[model samples]
Structure formats: C-alpha cells, structure tokens
Target: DQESCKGRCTEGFNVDKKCQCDELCSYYQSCCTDYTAECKPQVTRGD
Candidate 1:
C-alpha cells in the first residue's frame, strides 16, 4: 500500500512530464487523478 501511495502522492509533486503520480498512469488516471487517490484506494482495499 505504501508503494502505491508513494507513487500516487508524489506524482508530479516535484517534476512534471518526467514523472507523474501512479494515478496518472494511463489505465488508472481516471480513477486516481484526484490528490486523494492513494488513500482512497487504501481505504477501499481495507489496507
């Protein structure tokens, strides 16, 4: 879960095109675009 949160929270936090959040991934952007994507999924998965 931490791995997922790290990726999701830190996405584009410092860089731009070079790195984006996990939610920014093509398959997940829609579901995780918002800032809360990391914790959102964590709660959903009951992690």
Candidate 2:
C-alpha cells in the first residue's frame, strides 16, 4: 500500500507521460518506467 511506501521512488522508476498514480503520487511521479495509455495507480491508500 502507498501508506507503507517509503516516500521514495523505486529502482524501476522512469519517466513516462502515460505514467500515473492514484495513491502513491511520488511512486507514479518518480518510480514508473512502463509505458501505458492509462497508467492507473495501483495503491490502496496514502495519496
């Protein structure tokens, strides 16, 4: 869950306009390399 996140990006972090986050904004903004038309967030809480 985002609440459990360390408030830091992951190793797979990357830049992608399609990247998005619903709960873990930091993770989506920092840790997201995979490209997707709809990079929906996968966090349970902590936005």
Candidate 3:
C-alpha cells in the first residue's frame, strides 16, 4: 500500500513498515514497494 509510504520517504527506518524508506534501503534491498515510485525515483540511476 502506498499509504505505508506516504510522507515517509525522509522519515527513515520506521517500525510501521514491512520495508524501509531511507537511502540505506538501496543497499539493503528492503525498500517498501512504493519507495522508488514515490520516494527516490531515478536519483540513483547512474548505472
């Protein structure tokens, strides 16, 4: 659910989510389903 990600991009590791919403999520591979679509987007697309 996107609601799980609403305004949670900058909040970082919250116990309320199944995954994360912080920059660290990139390495953890545990970012919320909506993270990239609603949070960081294409910022880390240097690949």
Candidate 4:
C-alpha cells in the first residue's frame, strides 16, 4: 500500500484528508499523487 496521498486539491477544494491512491482518488481532484505499479511487460521466445 502507499503511504497515503499528500497532494492537496486545487482552488475551491478542501485539503484535510488523504487520498486512497487509486483511480477513484483522481476523480476528486487528484488527491493521490504517486505511481506505484507497472502496466506493460516483455515476452521472450522459448517454447
């Protein structure tokens, strides 16, 4: 798990809570500001 999001929402938003650091977290103004995983990988020829 992440150490909790420390980013604050832009103007017109509050900043007293931490983000969940997931896709949903960005919905509320990108509360979470960190990437903790990968999406692509390499394949080798062997079989």
Which numbered prediction scores highest in TM-score against the true structure? 3
Off by over 4 Å in 1: 1-16, 26-47
* Candidate 3 TM-score, C-alpha based: 0.54
Tell me the spans in candidate 4 whose CA falls farther than 4 Å from its real position.
5-17, 36-47
lDDT of each: 0.40, 0.38, 0.67, 0.36
Alpha-carbon TM-score of each model against the true structure? 0.20, 0.20, 0.54, 0.24
Error of 1 at 6 (Å): 8.2
- Predicted candidate 4 versus true structure: per-residue lDDT over 1-47, tens digit per residue: 65454333222224344444333333564444342332111224522
- For every candidate in turn, the CA RMSD to the true structure comes to 8.4, 10.9, 2.9, 11.9
Top-down lDDT ranking: 3, 1, 2, 4
Report clashes for each candidate as comma-separated counts: 1, 0, 0, 0
Candidate 3 lDDT score at position 26: 61
lDDT of 1 at 36: 59
| Candidate 1 per-residue lDDT over residues 3-34, each given as its tens digit | 23344454433333333454344344433334
For model 2, name the residue pairs that clash: none
Q: What is model 3's C-alpha RMSD?
A: 2.9
